[PDB]
Design a protein around this ligand. Structure first.
Ligand SMILES: *c1nc2c(c(=O)n(C)c(=O)n2C)n1COCCOC
Length: 144
């Protein structure tokens, strides 16, 4: 439980750091890192106590860990310029992290509801809109 929480928080931090160093598609990569850092903030607060998670909370945390591992795999893949160029030429909307953003948003909704109801923690609605704007800003930076 404590080890699981530390692993997820470390994943989020490595994803943010890797997104910050990305040389291409900076708006989309920076948005992914910023969103991940914001999602792990209440998990950092829960970790700062040292309570026991229910099995429903453990299930939701493990699903969130799986979405973060997928995001880390995508950032690692896109650290190679050729993989970015290949993916974007094949993509329809030019949104680099479309699939993993959907998974992060869906798994986060279940997890935050359990943190609020079970651990008394005090949403990805604008995300698809922000994704299209960041993708356009990135496409424009590339087209100069
Ligand atoms: C390859 N093809 C790209 C890009 C890119 O960043 N963007 C935003 C695109 O729209 N396309 C089609 N890359 C990545 O490499 C950028 C050029 O580096 C020299």
């Amino acid at each position: 439980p404590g080890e699981n929480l530390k692993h997820i928080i470390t994943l989020g931090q490595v994803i943010h750091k890797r997104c910050e160093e990305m040389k291409y598609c900076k708006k989309q990569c920076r948005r992914l890192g910023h969103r991940v850092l914001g999602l792990i903030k209440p998990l950092e607060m829960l970790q700062d106590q040292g309570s026991v998670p229910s099995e429903k909370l453990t299930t939701a945390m493990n699903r969130f860990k799986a979405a973060l591992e997928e995001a880390n795999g995508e950032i690692e893949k896109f650290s190679n310029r050729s993989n970015i160029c290949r993916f974007l030429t094949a993509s329809q909307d030019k949104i680099l992290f479309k699939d993993v953003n959907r998974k992060l948003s869906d798994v986060w909704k279940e997890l935050s509801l359990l943190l609020q109801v079970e651990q008394r923690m005090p949403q990805g609605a604008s995300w698809a809109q922000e994704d299209q704007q960041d993708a356009d800003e990135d496409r424009r930076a590339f087209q100069m």
